[PDB]
A = this chain, B = another copy of it.
Amino acid sequence: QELGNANFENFIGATEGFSEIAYQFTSHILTLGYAVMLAGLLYFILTIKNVDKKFQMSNILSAVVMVSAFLLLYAQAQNWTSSFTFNEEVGRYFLDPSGDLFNNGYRYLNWLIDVPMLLFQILFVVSLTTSKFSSVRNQFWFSGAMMIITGYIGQFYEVSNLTAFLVWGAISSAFFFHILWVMKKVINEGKEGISPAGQKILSNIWILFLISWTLYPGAYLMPYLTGVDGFLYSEDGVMARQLVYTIADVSSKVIYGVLLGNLAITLS
């Protein structure tokens, strides 16, 4: 079977196949994912009037991310189940080409909505001090798009060209470090001249942000984290990757949105 520049799930699914647990888990975690997003959409819409008009843009942007994330995860869940089919003679699910190969790249292009809107929404809650809004916004959006695109290219080479995979991901990482550096400047300015309770929320938002956002590059490298022919180069790694995605999606999108609403309430 010639798979070409495909993701490692397809190679696992075409050789070993997936056990019931691996196949079902992956389907279940993607389903939890999209349910959280649609549930989050309703929450953010229903709580808009819980904050001053000046902060209501943050609820709106949280809802815009929820829609993107719902539609994407819903599609990816159907994509997963269409790509792998059960073989009763062996009792494992194998790659079914009729359903197309499974690709994570669906998420990446959808992050062209999520990442800009997530970085933007804090600038409608915190007040900056030494930094200008257009400048920060422009840095966030430029580096976000660069990070996403360079990463989207690399992920097509995860099995077919390991050098390319690592170089594109290295470049993507440099844009990610820049986003982190700017979000730190934003959180620190935002803490200036606000209540101790709001500085506590901004402190938590910074940890959430740092961990949740670092899960994505960790999903990118998941197959190779246990090395050459390691534990993770297998159905366990396939499960690990979609699990990490779901955790990072809930944390980076919903819980972040909730924490930002709590900060808005404290400042209202």
**In contact, A89 and B36 (Cβ under 8 angstroms):** no
Which residues of chain B have C-beta atoms less than 8 A from A105's C-beta?
24-25, 28
Task: Tally chain A residues at the interface, Cβ within 8 Å.
Answer: 60
Distance in Å from the Cβ of A9 to the closest Cβ of chain B?
A: 13
A63 close to chain B: CB less than 8 A: yes
Distance in Å from the Cβ of A182 to the closest Cβ of chain B?
A: 23
**In contact, B97 and A38 (Cβ under 8 angstroms):** no
Q: A6-B20, A48-B46, A81-B100 are in contact. Are A110 and B31 (CB under 8 A)?
A: yes
**In contact, A110 and B32 (Cβ under 8 angstroms):** yes
A217 close to chain B: CB less than 8 A: no
**In contact, B113 and A72 (Cβ under 8 angstroms):** no
A67 close to chain B: CB less than 8 A: yes
Once the chains are docked, how many angstroms separate the CA of A226 from the CA of B253?
42
A–B complex contacts, Cβ < 8 Å, 18 sampled: A1-B88, A3-B20, A6-B20, A24-B103, A24-B156, A27-B106, A28-B103, A28-B108, A28-B109, A31-B71, A31-B72, A31-B110, A35-B67, A35-B71, A45-B46, A46-B60, A46-B63, A86-B101
Which residues of chain B have C-beta atoms less than 8 A from A43's C-beta?
60, 64
Contact of A20 among B5, B31, B71, B85 (CB under 8 A): B5
Which residues of chain B have C-beta atoms less than 8 A from A180's C-beta?
none
Q: A28-B105, A110-B31 are in contact. Are A42 and B64 (CB under 8 A)?
A: yes
Which residues of chain B have C-beta atoms less than 8 A from A109's C-beta?
28-29, 31-32
* A residues apposed to B, CB below 8 Å: 1-6, 19-21, 23-25, 27-29, 31-32, 34-36, 38-39, 42-43, 45-48, 60, 63-65, 67-68, 71-72, 75, 81, 85-93, 97-98, 100-101, 103, 105-106, 108-110, 112-113, 156
Q: A1-B88, A86-B100 are in contact. Are A39 and B67 (CB under 8 A)?
A: yes
Which residues of chain B have C-beta atoms less than 8 A from A6's C-beta?
20
Distance in Å from the Cβ of A226 to the closest Cβ of chain B?
A: 22
Contact of A68 among B21, B35, B71, B156 (CB under 8 A): B35
**In contact, B91 and A86 (Cβ under 8 angstroms):** no
Which residue, of A4, A29, A46, A85, has the highest number of chain B Cβ atoms within 10 A? A46
Q: A63-B42, A97-B87, A97-B88 are in contact. Are A19 and B4 (CB under 8 A)?
A: yes
